[PDB]
Design an enzyme around this catalytic site. Sequence first.
Site, PDB file in Angstrom:
ATOM      1  N   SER A 137      -6.218  38.929 113.792  1.00  0.00           N
ATOM      2  CA  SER A 137      -5.504  38.585 112.568  1.00  0.00           C
ATOM      3  C   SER A 137      -4.375  37.579 112.719  1.00  0.00           C
ATOM      4  O   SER A 137      -3.911  37.048 111.777  1.00  0.00           O
ATOM      5  CB  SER A 137      -5.043  39.810 111.822  1.00  0.00           C
ATOM      6  OG  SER A 137      -6.095  40.405 111.197  1.00  0.00           O
ATOM      7  N   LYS A 191      -4.395  34.172 110.802  1.00  0.00           N
ATOM      8  CA  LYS A 191      -3.993  34.110 109.438  1.00  0.00           C
ATOM      9  C   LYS A 191      -2.802  33.185 109.220  1.00  0.00           C
ATOM     10  O   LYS A 191      -2.693  32.573 108.212  1.00  0.00           O
ATOM     11  CB  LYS A 191      -3.738  35.494 108.889  1.00  0.00           C
ATOM     12  CG  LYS A 191      -4.994  36.319 108.717  1.00  0.00           C
ATOM     13  CD  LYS A 191      -4.725  37.719 108.237  1.00  0.00           C
ATOM     14  CE  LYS A 191      -5.965  38.539 108.331  1.00  0.00           C
ATOM     15  NZ  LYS A 191      -5.810  39.929 107.996  1.00  0.00           N
ATOM     16  N   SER A 230      -1.938  42.315 106.521  1.00  0.00           N
ATOM     17  CA  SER A 230      -3.159  41.787 107.146  1.00  0.00           C
ATOM     18  C   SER A 230      -4.405  42.099 106.324  1.00  0.00           C
ATOM     19  O   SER A 230      -5.372  42.687 106.821  1.00  0.00           O
ATOM     20  CB  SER A 230      -3.320  42.281 108.591  1.00  0.00           C
ATOM     21  OG  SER A 230      -4.000  41.303 109.405  1.00  0.00           O
ATOM     22  N   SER A 290      -5.172  43.137 115.459  1.00  0.00           N
ATOM     23  CA  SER A 290      -5.784  44.230 116.194  1.00  0.00           C
ATOM     24  C   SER A 290      -7.294  44.166 116.012  1.00  0.00           C
ATOM     25  O   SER A 290      -7.793  43.709 114.979  1.00  0.00           O
ATOM     26  CB  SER A 290      -5.233  45.584 115.744  1.00  0.00           C
ATOM     27  OG  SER A 290      -5.408  45.743 114.358  1.00  0.00           O
TER      28      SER A 290
HETATM   29  C1  LIG Z   1      -4.465  47.017 111.711  1.00  0.00           C
HETATM   30  C2  LIG Z   1      -5.139  45.936 111.357  1.00  0.00           C
HETATM   31  C3  LIG Z   1      -6.682  45.896 111.042  1.00  0.00           C
HETATM   32  S1  LIG Z   1      -7.117  44.735 109.921  1.00  0.00           S
HETATM   33  C4  LIG Z   1      -6.601  43.186 110.371  1.00  0.00           C
HETATM   34  C5  LIG Z   1      -7.598  42.417 111.387  1.00  0.00           C
HETATM   35  C6  LIG Z   1      -6.782  41.470 112.213  1.00  0.00           C
HETATM   36  O1  LIG Z   1      -6.378  41.678 113.308  1.00  0.00           O
HETATM   37  N1  LIG Z   1      -8.320  43.216 112.301  1.00  0.00           N
HETATM   38  C7  LIG Z   1      -9.712  43.468 112.024  1.00  0.00           C
HETATM   39  O2  LIG Z   1     -10.219  43.030 111.050  1.00  0.00           O
HETATM   40  C8  LIG Z   1     -10.510  44.287 113.026  1.00  0.00           C
HETATM   41  N2  LIG Z   1     -10.525  45.531 112.972  1.00  0.00           N
HETATM   42  O3  LIG Z   1      -9.808  46.148 111.935  1.00  0.00           O
HETATM   43  C9  LIG Z   1     -10.117  47.512 111.859  1.00  0.00           C
HETATM   44  C10 LIG Z   1      -9.478  48.248 113.035  1.00  0.00           C
HETATM   45  C11 LIG Z   1      -9.594  48.074 110.537  1.00  0.00           C
HETATM   46  C12 LIG Z   1     -11.632  47.689 111.910  1.00  0.00           C
HETATM   47  O4  LIG Z   1     -12.357  47.136 111.045  1.00  0.00           O
HETATM   48  O5  LIG Z   1     -12.155  48.380 112.818  1.00  0.00           O
HETATM   49  C13 LIG Z   1     -11.213  43.457 114.087  1.00  0.00           C
HETATM   50  C14 LIG Z   1     -12.157  43.842 115.107  1.00  0.00           C
HETATM   51  S2  LIG Z   1     -12.509  42.589 115.898  1.00  0.00           S
HETATM   52  C15 LIG Z   1     -11.705  41.427 115.267  1.00  0.00           C
HETATM   53  N3  LIG Z   1     -11.687  40.037 115.650  1.00  0.00           N
HETATM   54  N4  LIG Z   1     -10.946  41.936 114.196  1.00  0.00           N
HETATM   55  N5  LIG Z   1      -5.324  43.101 111.050  1.00  0.00           N
HETATM   56  C16 LIG Z   1      -4.502  44.351 111.522  1.00  0.00           C
HETATM   57  C17 LIG Z   1      -3.153  44.051 112.140  1.00  0.00           C
HETATM   58  O6  LIG Z   1      -2.849  44.565 113.243  1.00  0.00           O
HETATM   59  O7  LIG Z   1      -2.386  43.252 111.547  1.00  0.00           O
END
Ligand SMILES: C=C1CS[C@H]([C@@H](C=O)NC(=O)/C(=N\OC(C)(C)C(=O)O)c2csc(N)n2)N=C1C(=O)O
EC number: 3.5.2.6
Length: 259
Positions: free
Chosen positions: A43, A46, A103, A210
């Site tokens: 994220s 962004k 996010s 994350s």
């Molecule tokens: C807690 C979140 C999840 S959504 C969003 C996004 C960006 O990092 N992350 C994802 O979309 C994601 N998993 O989100 C969850 C954990 C909600 C999921 O869908 O499992 C992911 C896996 S691989 C990848 N590249 N992005 N950002 C955050 C943040 O820490 O700001």
Amino acid sequence: SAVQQKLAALEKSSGGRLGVALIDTADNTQVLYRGDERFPMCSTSKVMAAAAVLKQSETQKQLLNQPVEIKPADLVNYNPIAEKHVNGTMTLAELSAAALQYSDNTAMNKLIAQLGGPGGVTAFARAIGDETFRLDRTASTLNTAIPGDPRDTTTPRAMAQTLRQLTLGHALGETQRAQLVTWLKGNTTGAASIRAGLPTSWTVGDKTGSGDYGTTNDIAVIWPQGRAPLVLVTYFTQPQQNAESRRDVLASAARIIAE
Ligand SMILES: C=C1CS[C@H]([C@@H](C=O)NC(=O)/C(=N\OC(C)(C)C(=O)O)c2csc(N)n2)N=C1C(=O)O
């Protein structure tokens, strides 16, 4: 240096791979730890998309107030703000705030669409001198942060220099840069990351990330009192696909940096 020995020990204790870049705008000194290694951005990308839309608004004066429809098919894996406006509209300002401060991945996808796809985000990075950043995918219901995959990565050195140019430099116009700084300072998702390792009298704007492989990221611009600002990038990823998040590693890296 002493800082690199401590960051190496932190990394060893963690079981993962840690990447840190600090820029001190006082004399342009840098502290790097795996600063030229690739990390999955998650994220943290962004900020580049929000900045690219701000850049467009320097010519399209009313762009941030343009309404954008939120449709059920728009929703992806994580959309805490956009799900509140399905079958309604959000402005590009509200989408930028949702992407950066909650996010919201649907909000990010609207920014990407406004830029003509992920190649539009990467293009803006190249235009401001970032040759390293690459955004390859939109947010989807299944996203990945796979070891060795070059897609959607950057290095800590690159992202720190980019974050400095966007926030402290003049890669953006003056009102745009201030809006981006306001957005970052208002983030709600970073209390346990870089902010948690820093003296509370310091002003921070940050954006977290994350993902799987327990990828845990934060990029921050730091305003200590009576001192030139710093930019700090902390990226962290782990060998196991199902690994748990480790925001504490980012807090600890930042505390090591702040000495
Ligand atoms: C807690 C979140 C999840 S959504 C969003 C996004 C960006 O990092 N992350 C994802 O979309 C994601 N998993 O989100 C969850 C954990 C909600 C999921 O869908 O499992 C992911 C896996 S691989 C990848 N590249 N992005 N950002 C955050 C943040 O820490 O700001």
